[model samples]
Target chain A: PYLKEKSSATVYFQTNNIRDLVRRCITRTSQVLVILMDVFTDVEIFCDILEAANKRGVFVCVLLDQGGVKLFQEMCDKVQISDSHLKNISIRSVEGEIYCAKSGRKFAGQIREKFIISDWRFVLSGSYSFTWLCGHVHRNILSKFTGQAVELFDEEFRHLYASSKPVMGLKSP
Target chain B: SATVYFQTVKHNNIRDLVRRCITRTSQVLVILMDVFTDVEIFCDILEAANKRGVFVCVLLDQGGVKLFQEMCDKVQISDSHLKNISIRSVEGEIYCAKSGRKFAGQIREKFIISDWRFVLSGSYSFTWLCGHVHRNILSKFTGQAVELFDEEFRHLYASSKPVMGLKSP
Candidate 1:
């Protein structure tokens, strides 16, 4: 039985490094990539991939945490609203529990999960934040779930998008 | 393509399911269990999973982290592939995000999800004593039964604290 067993997780693993995985999957997206992450300082690392996906006309929307907004706001100025580099990317942040039920003060220890939905087939989630520390230091968790699960993330992400203020430039939501 | 199966550790091959679940996972693995005692077998698969670049994020309590404290320290010291297989301690009170209810001090619930398509959960403990002698129950679920449990597991994961975030001795 041991002789017959072959390894397949590695095939998935070799292609599963967080940055490469997120970048490749986002580029492969046909129409959209719905993302949720509070700690997103890795934007510099994945910025090119995000721009490439946008260049191909894929809509990339992120439901950011408060810190993520602060980090990306600076980039927003660098990119500018009319520069048309990453225009396909739309990011919105939740100020408090007022913006989202799960991410708000309504819950005692409010926790916002980090996940990424590529088009309609893939989902990457867990506690893994998109920070260099999260990517490099901390042992946070994240996973990739496909099929109907993608629909679930899409529904939840859109619900958040509906409540967000839709930041364009340096505007606050 | 969504289906759920109920399994008991005494009757069903629960270990096989978990081994396969970890092996077949393409992207990541999130495991939250209490008092993992079968380190020889359990740690082997996790090491393999980690070697393959799978992000094996483990959430344990005070009792759970002891088993791997040395290994985690080694990882931090070597600064190698430790990031791939992360071990963290669950912090504070675990209250369900949806229900906002405090969980029992013991992490009685155990479940494993392979890419969010398959789910295995029940009273089974990841320990040698329990696997060999105890008559615990674990269910193997696929299809529709998985999404809800996957969400529940995520809620548990998000609420828990990372070991790195906690004070280590």
Candidate 2:
């Protein structure tokens, strides 16, 4: 079934050439923003969110997994920025599903959803993760959808946020 | 008016959906699949599309070319049959300068745009081993999404390398 609300969607393959577009979306945010991903080590996007939260007063939250958390920490050290400067931006680590195989092998599956939602109205989603290598080197697809599609994704974000834990050691100054 | 339809591997036969989309194409078919190993798609459906005067442009992952060659050999696809079709492989242009280890920039996108009006995109890989055991979602869209995919295809096509020459049957 199709949605009644007037909506539009755009698909992009690889972020190597669309870094500016990604930044522009973050810079244009007025109210709230949420970036949910598996690996988000992209420094430029990280800085964009920081500026949005600190300068524009936009509330930003990032939901990441363990791999994402590790990469995020490494980026923090490399950039020499403390958590105190985060201001209106919040970060959390989402729990993953763990399963035991028939052969007695244990596996922890990470959340593979990658997308950025702005003002609860626009959503950019696909296999594209926000990472330096993923942006410059990997071949991935990211689709930007506006209108009722955003509501569907917002529901997903709410459920994920409910069970997530706030990242510690990156406290406000 | 724009329309959107969502389907998953669990409930729908995504493989048949892709074949039907290809079978229905009249003008042009642009596909960007990471790993397209389905022989039926490569040998039968795509070949039929090419034979029916449709322009078929396919861009596959660097590693995906091997299986494509195998499938072509299995069917003994003729050189004349490939005249109306173009296939390219996406390779690494950006890499680590120090270690000489190339960065992992795989073509992970699996999507198809038909006649510049409809798009089928999502986690559905064009392979036989996927849909049954793994969970995946594929969506069909009309209106603005098709244009976006078309633009992306052009960019990737310019950066990719065409297969030197396909072996004849």
Candidate 3:
């Protein structure tokens, strides 16, 4: 991204870019944050990052499509449950209507806005999905933006966070 | 410092992007993709670049190298004309993740870099779906990003070995 010293932005795509950035971002984060996505797998890669962030007292919220929440519960069903740090992170979901918070985007293709905002200063937004496929079969982008511009996203995230209900995972089968 | 942005390939016309990168490469061209087809189009560009003496290396997953071999089966293929071109497979022990796990020749997110000046990377592959049928992300980057990608390219290339199969097609 063309830039000035006042703020910085970086483009990231494909093969560990998203995972590496997310792992690094949450590791050092001192404040709370949110992860907006469609579906998230690849637990083996980033579960530690998410767990560590939450255990450090950084409140981490994950928002996803209701359909994805359904799928996630099914996968969790397959796994033998036990003590898990990632479970403590507040999980939520948006059912019914979901719309893009960022402008200049058409409506049809906007299932997930694909972004993560740490506190109110930084954000990663693009065609990216937090799902496992993002680092693999699906080509996607996650750009990091810093400075005052991110506050807008923080506000937007709070709005979604407020609207989304807590995830009601399937009562253990 | 480092520059980066996201791009949606209009109508998924990735061939145009692949074509130009291969055509204009001045020093080196490296590609790592899960699968490849439509070589009739890209191979010609690659062959032309090799003629001009660009250091060319291609690393493909099992499926892609198989297709490449099939393409060369007809003989007199332009790819056969280049000494600088090395087509290899990203298989066996070397290319696996740290956990030593894999899924069906699974290499995802393709990348192509030209002389390390810039890199084009994303999920787009040489398959027909990536060619146009599917909508995917293709990112072009410069600055420090190129070097980071070049390092990944090197690791994969070092692990890949030249293909040997059913004698081309």
Candidate 4:
């Protein structure tokens, strides 16, 4: 289940109703950003997240690595036609050079680490690869940090914004 | 020199088109971000072309060098064949010696050059995972487009240094 940070409070949960819990948190939030790897094979779930986040005027930026390009493309196509309130949507392949303000400049090959920053205030950074198999089969740890750490993370976000190439509305070549 | 630009959806068709240009006594120089794990398929094609004495040089992203070492351990490619292959990393930016300097992010264009004939394909590296698995968009161009790309690649190569021998995996 997805949990939101309130000030600097730690969130603890135990539930078999993961889908409902995640749905509730997502619906309540106004802005969300997800950095993920692996292919999102579940088209319905993918659509649900985008639809929910977009409806709430969320700015979604996805940094896809490895085999995540297909899923990112599908989501972009959906965003193109839908009247979702998505302010900005972007996807970048982590294969070449990636320039970010926080970490300076890094290449896709150096991207052995994985993390997710949401809304510039909360960040989930750890060894989680965001693969379905990773969630089910592997023991993954995702930490949520707030306050100064979040601000530091946002610097990286700005760097990513400055360095990344926009993936939206390019003619298919 | 006619600069013709066209886009196509078929990935293999684009590869074939580039292959045709290379076969016609064209020097094919490629600068890739990184060579993915499953590059054997493309290597096979390169091997065949190399046997035919095609002048092909490759500059891979720094991260790809580690993978190249791993591939060398698994695949028994000759040193001479390896000589025909060169990999280098572009630090900060990919520079072109002839054109003063060309920065990174500015060199996102994909291209293939054969003599006066050139094809520019606006796609990621030619990997099965990139084309078939990831379903990325790719574009192709022929004729005058070759000069634009060849100049960039040649310049990058002229300023770049070859990476050292691979470490045993």
Candidate 5:
């Protein structure tokens, strides 16, 4: 399945070493990758995404939830991704929520979606967070895609990217 | 496309729809819930499904356990009916940024694969009060989408532990 020029849709769970799956999917991309993550702290996979931008010149755009922003900034600082390669990557942090009539308080609602669009032809989604995977077992799902689901995810990506704020010191375009 | 449906809580009665799906299932229902505090669904609908002989497996995160415990204390189910409902907490520590620092975390996925025929997943947490207050999308995937999720359910089930004192909470 890994050797094909046109990969197929598949689903993976935590037992499948989902972090490696995220890395390999990012590794295989050549043109574009759009990511929307609620929790992202896996440095190794983050480095692979950087490699995609720095080495292969893939256009990478990332939209993060409030929870991931701090660690993402830390990664960018610790890794020191080159300024030139920074042009190939775009990142935004989304802080969004709505009022609950019953609770009468601000609901802790933000970007709770997690998915990745690769090359506009494939999608990876599920309940899985892109974080360190060694310590605990999680009941998560990661589904890879190549069909109609990609369109919906792409549209969601655009909508999120449109309303998001640019990460500090990062260019919007 | 016919097999895939997408709806938000704004227009559709998502809670009712989910209850309908669970009520109609005849074979198996597998759920991966990060925050499952819906008492109506948890105490009533799921118990109904259990009584009908449908296998119900629920895998929850560590944080989800507290909420599950809350529901467990409120509901009363026969021991036999409860036996058909398998509730387990997923094993794992998820380290993520919280209040500018790292903390022990667990799963945050919320989806239910019903009868291995369709999968429902997205931002919707199974909460009774706050579920509709937040912006959420629920995607229902059938046809080709069911197989992969079924496989994922198997793996998650394999990597989990049974909830202690299933009958007691």
Candidate 6:
């Protein structure tokens, strides 16, 4: 029934327009979810958004790229958010790579997709990395797929959720 | 009245000098980056200039764009006004014109052109991060130097294509 009711959806490609979408999400949805790789320098803005969302009671979860636990720690330092809130965040590292902190999980390779799903109504998919420049100018594309097609991405998110190792505190090494 | 040119093996010195100059200047500033500079202070200077309404333009190579993005992420300015600075890469061009070869080498030059009154261009991309790692040179140009650098700018502008943002997802 999910597929039948929402068979096809529109996909929007976004290069320099990620901010607009983020703004829209802040206003439209009660919860916002982001899956990103390498959150290194962009942690400031993420913190801003996360703080804003938390203030507004928007549940947020972030999945870090493999070897990106350091970035998470850096974010923890800059944002000054409590380690308890960071518990919802997790990390995925490549198997056999020991760079990840003990709390970070290891995956096979890079999780290279940029997708934002909000309240099961809107889905944003793109080639743009979650980096600031990619969100602004790196010639990336984003597609918005609605209805039943959203279920496909949701299934993928489920897989990621199952394999990802949950971070307990912001004190990750 | 002569065009000055010099070469050095550092980027930070040049970058600091440029930052100081730009901070003092009361006119328009235009910058083009054939390769991206990933320094946090540079991004801070750029954000300050943009806020002050200085006309700043950044042209990056594809690789530069990717790396610049990474640098922005590192600085935590991704969601700030710094994120609004638009950079586009030359789709087909990969190497700096002087190099004439597509190898991963330093830009070896620092160029600061202000309001057609001064033009400084030489072997420094202008960042402290590359200080010991690269060799670069810079020259101060007035009058005739302005004309020469302007001519080069024209040539580059004419040959360069407008960068388009990627489609939304």
Local distance difference test values of all predictions, in order: 0.54, 0.70, 0.59, 0.44, 0.68, 0.48
lDDT of 6 by residue, B44-77 (tens): 4565456565544454544466666666667654
Q: Interface Cα RMSD per model, in Å?
A: 15.1, 4.3, 8.1, 21.4, 4.5, 21.6
Give the number of the best model, judged by lDDT: 2
Model 2 C-alpha lDDT per residue in residues B28-132, reported as the tens digit of each score:
888888887677777644555556877777888787888887777787866677776777887645567468975545777778888887888876677765433
**Which 10-residue window in model 5 chain A sums to the lowest lDDT?**
A1-10
lDDT score at residue A66, model 4, on the 0-100 scale: 41
Docking class of 4: incorrect
lDDT tens readout by residue for model 1, A38-119: 6566655456546655567677777776545777666556655353554566666653232223455332111244567776
Query: How do the predictions measure up, each by TM-score?
Result: 0.45, 0.69, 0.57, 0.40, 0.74, 0.43
Write the residue-wise lDDT of candidate 3 on B1-169 in tens digits. Answer: 4332222324434556767777888887777777776655456545655568777667777656766667666454553455666667874232445588654435554678888788876546676544543333355677877776777777666766666321221
Q: How close to the true structure is residue B97 of candidate 6, measured as C-alpha lDDT?
A: 43
Preferred candidate (TM-score higher): 2 or 5: 5
lDDT (Cα, tens digit) per residue for candidate 1, span B51-163: 67566666675557776565446445333444466556663333343378644333434567666666665445566644443323344556766666666566666766666
Per-chain TM-score, chain A, candidate 5: 0.80
Candidate 1's DockQ is 0.04
Off by over 4 Å in 2: A1-5, A11-17, A77-87, A95-104, A108-110, A138-142, A163-173, B1-29, B37-57, B66-87, B92-96, B100-109, B115-117, B127-139, B144-148, B151-169
State each model's C-alpha RMSD to the native: 16.2, 5.5, 8.8, 19.5, 5.5, 20.1
Candidate 4: segments with Cα more than 4 A from true spot: A1-173, B1-33, B94-110, B164-169
Worst 10 residues of 2 chain B by lDDT: B1-10
Q: Candidate 6: misplaced stretches above 4 Å?
A: A1-5, A11-15, A32-40, A84-108, A168-173, B1-169
Model 5 stretches astray by more than 4 angstroms? A1-9, A80-85, A100-108, A134-139, A169-173, B1-17, B44-47, B50-55, B61-63, B75-84, B88-111, B122-124, B128-130, B133-169
Error of 1 at A15 (Å): 11
lDDT sort, best first: 2, 5, 3, 1, 6, 4
lDDT of 4 by residue, B80-105 (tens): 55544455553224334457865332
Please give the lDDT score at residue B126 for candidate 1.
69
Cα lDDT for residue B57, candidate 3: 68
